From a paper:
Human calcium-sensing receptor (CaSR) is a G-protein-coupled receptor (GPCR) that senses small fluctuations of extracellular levels of Ca2+ ions in the blood. It maintains Ca2+ homeostasis by the modulation of parathyroid hormone (PTH) secretion from parathyroid cells and the regulation of Ca2+ reabsorption by the kidney. Like most class C GPCRs, CaSR functions as a disulphide-linked homodimer. In this study, we have determined the cryo-EM structures of CaSR in the fully inactive and agonist+PAM bound states.
We used an inhibitory nanobody to stabilize the conformation of CaSR in the inactive state. Cryo-EM data present three conformations of inactive CaSR with an overall resolution of 5.79 Å, 6.88 Å, and 7.11 Å, respectively. The local refinement focusing on the ECDs and the 7TMDs was performed separately to improve the resolutions to 4.5 Å and 4.8 Å, respectively, with quality density throughout, which enabled us to confidently build the backbone of the inactive CaSR model. In the inactive structure, there is only one interface at the apex of the receptor and the VFT module adopts an open conformation with the nanobody binding at the left lateral side of each LB2 domain. Our inactive structure shows that the B-C helix angle is about 117° and VFT domain adopts an open–open conformation. In our inactive cryo-EM structure, the B–C helix angle is similar to that of mGluRs in the inactive state, with the VFT domain adopting an open–open conformation. Therefore, our inactive cryo-EM structure represents the full inactive state. The cryo-EM structure of CaSR in inactive state displays a relatively large backbone separation distance of 56.26 Å between the C-terminal ends of N541 of each LB2 domain, while it reduces to 45.8 Å in the CaSRIoo state and 41.8 Å in the CaSRIcc state. Superposition of the inactive and agonist+PAM bound LB2 domains shows that NB-D211 occupies the spatial position of the LB2 domain of the other protomer, which blocks the approach of another corresponding subunit LB2. Comparing our inactive open–open conformation (CaSRfully inactive) with their CaSRIcc revealed similar 7TM domains, but two totally different VFT module conformations, with their closed–closed conformation presenting similar characteristics to the active state.
Residue numbers in the entry:
A (entry chain B): 1 to 123
B (entry chain D): 1 to 124
C (entry chain A), D (entry chain C): 23 to 54, 65 to 99, 105 to 163, 185 to 357, 393 to 866
Amino acid sequence: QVQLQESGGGSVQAGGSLRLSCAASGFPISTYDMGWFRQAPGKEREGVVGITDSFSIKYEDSVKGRFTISRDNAKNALYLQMNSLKPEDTGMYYCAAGDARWSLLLRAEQYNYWGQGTQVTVS
Amino acid sequence: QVQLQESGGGSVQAGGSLRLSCAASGFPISTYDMGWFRQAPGKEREGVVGITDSFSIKYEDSVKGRFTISRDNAKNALYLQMNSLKPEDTGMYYCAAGDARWSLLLRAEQYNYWGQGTQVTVSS
Amino acid sequence: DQRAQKKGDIILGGLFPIHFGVAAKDQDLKSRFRGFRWLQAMIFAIEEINSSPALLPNLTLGYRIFDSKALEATLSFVAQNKIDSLNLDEFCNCSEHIPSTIAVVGATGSGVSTAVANLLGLFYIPRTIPNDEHQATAMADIIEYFRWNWVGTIAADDDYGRPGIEKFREEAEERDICIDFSELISQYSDEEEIQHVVEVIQNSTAKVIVVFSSGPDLEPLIKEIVRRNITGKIWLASEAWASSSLIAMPQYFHVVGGTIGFALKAGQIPGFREFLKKVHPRKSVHNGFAKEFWEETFNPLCTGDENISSVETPYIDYTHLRISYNVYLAVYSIAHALQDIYTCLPGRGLFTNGSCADIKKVEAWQVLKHLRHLNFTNNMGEQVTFDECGDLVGNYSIINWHLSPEDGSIVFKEVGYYNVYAKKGERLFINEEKILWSGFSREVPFSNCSRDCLAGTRKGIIEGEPTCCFECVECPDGEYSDETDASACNKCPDDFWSNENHTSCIAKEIEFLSWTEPFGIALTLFAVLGIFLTAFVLGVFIKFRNTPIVKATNRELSYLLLFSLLCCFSSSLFFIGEPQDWTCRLRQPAFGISFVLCISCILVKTNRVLLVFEAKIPTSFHRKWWGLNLQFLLVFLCTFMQIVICVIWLYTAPPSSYRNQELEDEIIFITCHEGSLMALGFLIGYTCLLAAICFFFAFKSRKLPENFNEAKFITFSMLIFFIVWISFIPAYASTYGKFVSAVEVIAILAASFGLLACIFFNKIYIILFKPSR
Amino acid sequence: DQRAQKKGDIILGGLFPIHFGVAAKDQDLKSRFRGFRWLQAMIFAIEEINSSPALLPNLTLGYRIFDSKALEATLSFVAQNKIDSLNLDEFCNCSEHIPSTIAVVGATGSGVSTAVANLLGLFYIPRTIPNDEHQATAMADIIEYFRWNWVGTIAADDDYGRPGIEKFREEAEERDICIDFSELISQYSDEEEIQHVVEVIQNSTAKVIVVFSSGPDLEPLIKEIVRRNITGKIWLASEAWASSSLIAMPQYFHVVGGTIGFALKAGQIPGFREFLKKVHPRKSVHNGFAKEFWEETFNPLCTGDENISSVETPYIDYTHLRISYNVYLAVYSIAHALQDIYTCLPGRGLFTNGSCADIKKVEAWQVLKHLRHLNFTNNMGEQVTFDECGDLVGNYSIINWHLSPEDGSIVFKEVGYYNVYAKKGERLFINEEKILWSGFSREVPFSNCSRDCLAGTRKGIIEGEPTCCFECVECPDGEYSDETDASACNKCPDDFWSNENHTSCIAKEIEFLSWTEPFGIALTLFAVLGIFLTAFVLGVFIKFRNTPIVKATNRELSYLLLFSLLCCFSSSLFFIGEPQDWTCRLRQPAFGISFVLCISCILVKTNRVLLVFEAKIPTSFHRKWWGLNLQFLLVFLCTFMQIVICVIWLYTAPPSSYRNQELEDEIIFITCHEGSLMALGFLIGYTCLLAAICFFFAFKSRKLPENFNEAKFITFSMLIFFIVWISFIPAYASTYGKFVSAVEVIAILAASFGLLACIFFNKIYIILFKPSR
């Protein structure tokens, strides 16, 4: 019963901001989290950001303050606000739902669900 | 992308009334209906009643006087009310989805979707 | 890539999917497993075919091995009858030969061989290990009768542990089971992260929980929480086959004690040790690749004579291997099916081609026949008929753990005797009582998040939040349901007060303007004193009138004064009492006539003290009245217009207005409920105007001295009492007091007392002075 | 079960899934199809390899055939390299040989071979026919720019026609496309039933529609509706490859004319006839089972020499077969890929095992490489790169049909030049204009169920009904939106009337108690006549006072009468005018003082006509006034208490009440907005009481004859004018008329005129009689 959708794929410059929204279908994100990962086309998939089941986040040095992720159980949706991104922020944004660990979400290959893999090009 | 579940499966007498309510999930009923058929377990599936997406109904010879079928677009679910039933009420109510003809829905094999087929044995 | 032809054409060979690679299997199981189970199976086979009279003496024995893996797994699955049917290769001088492989181990790991067997028509699922779906069904079956709503979940990296958690995910919703957390534990987990998840565990306050962790996976979990010593905790250790094995340390059960968990008792294999002792270095005519892996795992530079005992005894860790016992039972069932078809009735199967079940087998279609619809009764277990969903399922031993102070360990209780399969039923078979763990506490009285609130309340729900958590809010006013936790809050009868439920009532005390309470006593005392003084003035009047001065003055004046006081006081008496419509018909005209004729007596006294004059002519009336008839008919015309307008509003429609009280909520007081009474107000105003008339004749009385100055007292008493009555009538008409105690009654009685004190007292004194009047 | 090895190791063989049975294929296609396409493919191959310098001269040619079907479909899919890798059967003297099959026809019919090729790693989808999903995308792409909400659906029993209808079902909702009907048509349909569905079609009034019926399926559909002759109908004939073929009869386009439908132009195969002429009875060294089906379809009792022309010419019905052209293009692409790998660069692929692309091929992995990322440019079509979703997609010819009166037929227009694939874009490429069908009517102006209603309105929605159908209902009062069809109905400025939108306004005419309208003229005339008569009485007074009778009578009496009339009339003049707070401060004390001193003059005239008397003592005041100072100070004390209470309510808080009008909805009238003015009512009552005083002195004037009987007139005028003023003051205080025209002004002016007529007229007449006064 894992279904997800992506919205907000546009094009902005380095200084531009981007809004990204993920909506679930019947899946309550209170039971388990949902991971968001960045994979430029032609290369492997790396987890730039990741949220634990609780209201805690695990970032990387490339998303310090530039990426903000918001989650709430009532609306079963995820929000990503990006501000002042580095120019090669272009890539494919992938959503996953699947039981994992604290660091096993950074590598992001243990998720059973596979998303549509919407491609976003900003340059 | 069509799902359904059966409810109201109980045992009554020959003159008793049985209530069946089934709510669709993830699929509006405006595009097409959701047919219901009655199969005696251990033999071929038979269609006692037939719904039409244009809100028309089609009944067999003996259905008149004992079966009432209710369906609406706003609520997209189906009610089946039975009274003054035949004494041998043992059977399984099978739900099917898919475009077909009137005779095709009466035979009831043109539907692509297959339900779980919850069964209640009244045996009265 | 292994190929093990054996006793009989039925050859239980092919690559084993449980092994995923040569290196995997070499440094995972064979480096210290090692494929000895099939040797025991072949023992049993050769020992039982010697017992049998030539069960299957057709083909010979031979072992040849050459060790994703799909290509060689299917290639070893390739028999010879499939590649020689027509197959007219001019260089292939093939001959007829039929092997058939059935056994599959580790089917969950690789399903390509299952698909191949599905397409070929040789599908043979015996995973012979019972699946975890039955265990999830069992944990649900223990969910219902606990009568508790939500439960927590803990999982690990185990592949078999996932399908349980997903299945719980899709079954929880239809029977309101809420999930607060479901997180994974790996082989090694971070410290501060585990502290964080356990902290959010205390935050969630979801005390009941089920854990899917394996032994070594759950060992750190029981380890961390020892430091902080929170020990009111209960678990649900599923698949606890190794019960109290890795948790056996003391003081651990002070935290992890009283845990109930599933288990499966496994029959010990007879002579397992001597089964495993037969393998020796380089005396083995068969299974040459047993020899190769023995060579490569003990590199062969040296160690060419060591035995299993000389090696570091690898038969202590696995005293009874689950997969070994499962494949043992599977091969036993297959051998029993072969014996059966050797001794079956003369009859045929149900499949059209390849319907040759004889001493010579064609594609092994009778084996699935005897699996599907035949009993086994093998290995003192009394197995059920082999089924697709469940191959061989026994009674699940739901073991309970008890601390043993005399032993310092955990004792197990088989009190859980149940299974989910239909061999015993779909209903309960569990013993719940006669067990304890530091008291009787597993009921968990506060496992429900919300309590049973007081009656007449809705278990208000947070939108987008599971129905388990509800907070109770008070029903609207005047509405109250009898039993607690009633969603359909219903109307309550109007016979009780708020009664700690905020209800409404309509049946209360009714004010009848007279009661045993002191206001009634006071008004009755006023009434009786008025009656007594009227009796006294009647006595003094009858004393006055006995004298022959009668008809020298106007006796009718005092007679009608007495009638006026009597009727006005009768109206005052009628004023109190239980109010209804009939009382109003008997009251309102009485009030009007009393007012008009009392005031008419006042006016006829004020205008002319002595007799009136008129012409002396013979008519229908008598002559002695000397003109009094005109005064009588003036008062009479007032009286008529009053009672005829009364009957005009009588016969047209009864004068009933809407039933109103001081407050419709708690006060239920019956009133006159007559109406505005426009004509009543008009006649009251006309009476007031009539009182305003004859002021100037009272002044023509102030000038001349009359009968030793008595009319001046009448004049000022007129003034003061009329003005006080007209000033206190609208206060009664406006103030709420009319409901609690009528003010018109006291106003009119005071006015009447003043009116009698105007003249009666003065002329009583006068006749006490001069009796001649 | 067919096996066709051919020129080169690449062998394009295996059972064709398009055939579902031996009898099916025998009496469906071969009885009159018949597998000639592969012969043409092998022709093209042989002369293309003669053109090429030894393209693939490795293996030979050979055809052997033996004709669910899954078992033999996969068995023919079995090559020889799969069953000889290790395969050490002691009797199988196998040798190395590698065939590889790619072509799949009728993949939609049977997917088991696709699954087999998926598991083996030899997946090859070229259904080479473009799928109907692209056609559904195209029909959607023509949905948006028509700018119309709903559309009807008609389907048939065709298997390919279903996925379109389901896809429309799940795409309609997110972009508000409503469906009214979607029913199936079989090969034969009942008459009264079809009449019933068409009747509910007119009932639905869903005029725009799309039909998925095939030619012979839609032929009855165009047939039935001819009888009733309803001919305003437009269709959307999807997959109309055979356009105007079965509908070509005259008078049919009077009903079915002007239909727009998709089509695909197919290039004619060069020499198709001579391609099909080569097959002859019993001169065929290859394809022996071509011979068997020729024998069995022409049973062989006789007919051993007949040719295709002698048979009933089975090459008229299918001039160009779609599947034939599709497989022709597929085999051309495969041959071009083989030529490419023969002439590719020296480099390696992406796979790890089987990475041997040389003159000798291993498992045909380069063919999918050149399909996935290489152009074709074959058969003068300039094909796009082969893709999984779409293999080879050309420009969709959206053909439009026009009636030709000069020809009596239908002419086609390629005006639709578009495709859904990304080769040209995702946006519009369609020509819409310069076409007509009995006029310009395809816009369908009333295709929207609901119209654009007037501004300020809710397109109210039926609950549980699609948003397409909305009925317009009027916004609440005082609220109005500017543009039509505004869901967010917003507040409107308060400057206009209902203006056919039911709005509200607050800016209207304001009553200032004086205007050019005739009421203002009348009140101004009354004011000016009053002023003129005051001037005249001032003149006659100055005439009277010039005589030396002054100081023999009281000149102060008439002087203060003139001051009283002046100030009372000034208050009357101040009564009208624009009302504000400052006007009220200047007005209310003026009203009070005018009332009290005018009435004080009246009282001082009534009590004593002649001079007052008092003791003669020397004090601060002067002596000649002879006691008038007490009357002055009595009037003065009244005046003070008035103006000091005025200032008491002045300095404490300005007397401003809430701004109220006759009606808050449409009437905006500025009023005094002062308050209840309790002390003003008290002083008015005191003034009325003062008027009630001195009645008895007026009576002491009625007895004695004074100055030839003038005070009686004063007395009765006192009575009548005081009572009329006191009776008309509450009517003004209660009646609404005070807003439209003040009644107090006319009341006070009439009262003042009467007061002057009391004495001034009488004594003017007297002095006209006797000047000595």
